[PDB]
Amino acid sequence: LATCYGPVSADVMAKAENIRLLILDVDGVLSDGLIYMGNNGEELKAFNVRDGYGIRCALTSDIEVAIITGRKAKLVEDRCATLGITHLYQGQSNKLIAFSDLLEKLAIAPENVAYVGDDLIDWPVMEKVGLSVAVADAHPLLIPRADYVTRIAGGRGAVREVCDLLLLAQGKLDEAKGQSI
Amino acid sequence: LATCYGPVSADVMAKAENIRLLILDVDGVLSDGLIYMGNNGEELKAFNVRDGYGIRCALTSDIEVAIITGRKAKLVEDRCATLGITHLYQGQSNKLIAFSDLLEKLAIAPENVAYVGDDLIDWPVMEKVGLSVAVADAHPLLIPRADYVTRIAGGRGAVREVCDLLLLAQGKLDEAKGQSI
Amino acid sequence: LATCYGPVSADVMAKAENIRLLILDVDGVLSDGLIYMGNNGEELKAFNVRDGYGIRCALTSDIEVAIITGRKAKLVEDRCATLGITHLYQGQSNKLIAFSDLLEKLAIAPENVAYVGDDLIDWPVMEKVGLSVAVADAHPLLIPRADYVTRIAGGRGAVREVCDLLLLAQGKLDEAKGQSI
Amino acid sequence: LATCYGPVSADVMAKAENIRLLILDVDGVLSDGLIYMGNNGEELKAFNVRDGYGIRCALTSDIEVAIITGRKAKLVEDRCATLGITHLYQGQSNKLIAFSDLLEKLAIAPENVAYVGDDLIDWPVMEKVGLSVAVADAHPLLIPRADYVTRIAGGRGAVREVCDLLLLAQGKLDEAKGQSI
Ligand SMILES: [Ca+2]
Ligand SMILES: [Ca+2]
Ligand SMILES: [Ca+2]
Ligand SMILES: [Ca+2]
Ligand SMILES: [Cl-]
Ligand SMILES: [Cl-]
Ligand SMILES: [Cl-]
Ligand SMILES: [Cl-]
Numbered sequence: 001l002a003t004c005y006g007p008v009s010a011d012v013m014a015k016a017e018n019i020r021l022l023i024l025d026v027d028g029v030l031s032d033g034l035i036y037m038g039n040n041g042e043e044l045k046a047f048n049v050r051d052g053y054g055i056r057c058a059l060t061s062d063i064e065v066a067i068i069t070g071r072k073a074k075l076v077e078d079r080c081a082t083l084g085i086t087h088l089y090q091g092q093s094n095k096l097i098a099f100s101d102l103l104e105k106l107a108i109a110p111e112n113v114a115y116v117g118d119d120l121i122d123w124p125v126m127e128k129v130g131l132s133v134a135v136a137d138a139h140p141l142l143i144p145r146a147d148y149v150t151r152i153a154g155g156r157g158a159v160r161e162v163c164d165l166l167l168l169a170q171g172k173l174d175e176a177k178g179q180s181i
Numbered sequence: 182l183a184t185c186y187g188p189v190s191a192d193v194m195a196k197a198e199n200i201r202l203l204i205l206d207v208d209g210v211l212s213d214g215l216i217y218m219g220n221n222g223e224e225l226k227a228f229n230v231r232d233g234y235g236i237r238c239a240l241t242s243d244i245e246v247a248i249i250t251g252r253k254a255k256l257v258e259d260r261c262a263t264l265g266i267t268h269l270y271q272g273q274s275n276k277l278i279a280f281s282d283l284l285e286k287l288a289i290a291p292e293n294v295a296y297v298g299d300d301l302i303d304w305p306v307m308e309k310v311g312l313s314v315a316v317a318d319a320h321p322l323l324i325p326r327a328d329y330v331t332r333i334a335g336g337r338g339a340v341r342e343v344c345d346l347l348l349l350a351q352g353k354l355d356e357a358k359g360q361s362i
Numbered sequence: 363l364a365t366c367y368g369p370v371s372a373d374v375m376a377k378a379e380n381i382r383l384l385i386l387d388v389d390g391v392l393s394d395g396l397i398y399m400g401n402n403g404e405e406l407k408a409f410n411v412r413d414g415y416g417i418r419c420a421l422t423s424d425i426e427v428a429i430i431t432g433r434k435a436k437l438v439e440d441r442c443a444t445l446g447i448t449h450l451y452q453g454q455s456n457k458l459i460a461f462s463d464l465l466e467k468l469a470i471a472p473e474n475v476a477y478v479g480d481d482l483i484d485w486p487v488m489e490k491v492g493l494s495v496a497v498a499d500a501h502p503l504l505i506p507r508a509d510y511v512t513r514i515a516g517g518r519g520a521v522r523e524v525c526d527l528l529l530l531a532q533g534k535l536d537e538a539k540g541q542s543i
Numbered sequence: 544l545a546t547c548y549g550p551v552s553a554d555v556m557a558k559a560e561n562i563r564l565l566i567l568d569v570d571g572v573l574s575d576g577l578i579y580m581g582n583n584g585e586e587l588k589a590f591n592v593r594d595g596y597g598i599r600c601a602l603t604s605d606i607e608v609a610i611i612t613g614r615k616a617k618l619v620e621d622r623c624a625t626l627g628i629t630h631l632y633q634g635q636s637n638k639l640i641a642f643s644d645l646l647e648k649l650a651i652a653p654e655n656v657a658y659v660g661d662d663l664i665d666w667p668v669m670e671k672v673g674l675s676v677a678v679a680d681a682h683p684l685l686i687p688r689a690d691y692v693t694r695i696a697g698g699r700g701a702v703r704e705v706c707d708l709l710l711l712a713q714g715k716l717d718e719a720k721g722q723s724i
Pocket of ligand 7: 431
């Protein structure tokens, strides 16, 4: 029950131990929620390298990683390519559609899935999964619903915190390896 | 009186109950006040997806949304397109003009209007509306003048907080649906 | 001695009363110190509209505004054009050179000048002026040398805070007009 | 043992006195860890001018500066050119390679090297050097391993803090000269 971010319940650790697939929202989870827009139609989004390391650890220690996001941008495809994420659903605000598709294709039971969200749109999927996670600065109405609330804010390493938790629960943390990219 | 951001007064809830139009400043309200400028004349501004969700909820819950801003940029037109906002006034440093235009165009009384601002230039309109709001980190001189002061800072979900308040006051918060974009 | 940011000394108010010229550093004063750089050689810098409003008030209330910075970028020329700043010195790491030119050009005594800095490179000039200001989050070694330390951090409205102070000290605050740009 | 960021140990100051080479990570040390990505494959990273000043002081006070990073970007080359850094290793998955090359090329012993990191990938090099530094907001598992934990966060002047410490320890702080760029 001890972790480098502080104590976790036995129940959260047991849920984390079973995790075969980690699903992430983007905006407000992998980022602090900001969308950068320019006069020539440019768009930027900011990701955190500390999360990149966690995702690389997950992917090289037998935990699959997927993304389901309401927005759609080529930059997100590029981020996934950097990190080796091969399951990406964009443009999807009815996330249960993507959820159903993903689990059918991978043959994974919902109880072996974790989901990290930050807003109410995430809840229908979070309700179904083995380990639901809200980031520290998630919408107030989402926070009390999740199995685990991260210590770290969205875009600041909430995703690394979840990666670290899964790895720890599975006895993979000490020997995990990643790239901080 | 209890909200997910903390208690509010009966007077504020009563004001919020009657709101048919939400008017928003941009810089310092929908953003944290920063203007990104480049050597080739590029310009960026950052918006928050959490505010996007609130605006989508409002617009699909019979609450119109308008924007009045002192600056002018194509990127702001683009953001409004994303969110389905059809009332945008840019390059406006006498805000009473756009305000009067909206009252006429939407056949609406000032008491049915809310305004979210962050600086002194917003007060002439805020003075007239049914629910005036200053964001948590508005200019110190503006804060004591508003009906309601948000808990959340400009660009970090102050607008969502206001959307949430209107929907709650109007008994629409539970069934409200949007896209976090 | 009261201000909207907190009490100030009689001595600081008296110094502020006499200011005919406001000199500002850029990086860490008008911004939070960040330089955005891209792979195509793009460069961005972020300014705060809250400071834009203060600068506009100063300029239209018989207080000249000048900028002395160690870096050089076209975007800074563009920012100055937005705000109507006509006294700009870039690529200047010996700031006394630019300081001397300014005083000579404008025929103004040092005691009638305020300077807002955030690092040790600003001290030679700050040492000579009537009102030296360090931003709240200036380098620790600079802070104790300044006449006034702002409550607000660089890039977050420290410059607005100084503009407000000068205008208050000179009985111009209530009637000052600017644009939030 | 007093510093402008607070007291340090006799041991840390003695280690700092012997430093002839300062090695820095980029993401999360020279920046706050964020990677900005756009739809046309643009990339931005943000550096802090306060760090630039410290690096300029180090380089002109007989302290070499090198950078070892896991990512690779032309913008980092450009940043190094601005600051006069001539020792840069990018795309480095095993940071010990660059470290060995540096000891070789510069004919310096590991006890005369400082290293500033923020994540677990930095530890293999940090383990070997004379002064290991973790930034204030480094990964929680790195923090207790370092000789010195900075007060300032990555991207906010943690590097400046380390530059100031080395200069102070070597009796070079008072007379050090730089450019805040
Ligand atoms: Ca989200
Ligand atoms: Ca504003
Ligand atoms: Ca500066
Ligand atoms: Ca790093
Ligand atoms: Cl979403
Ligand atoms: Cl405005
Ligand atoms: Cl400078
Ligand atoms: Cl790295």
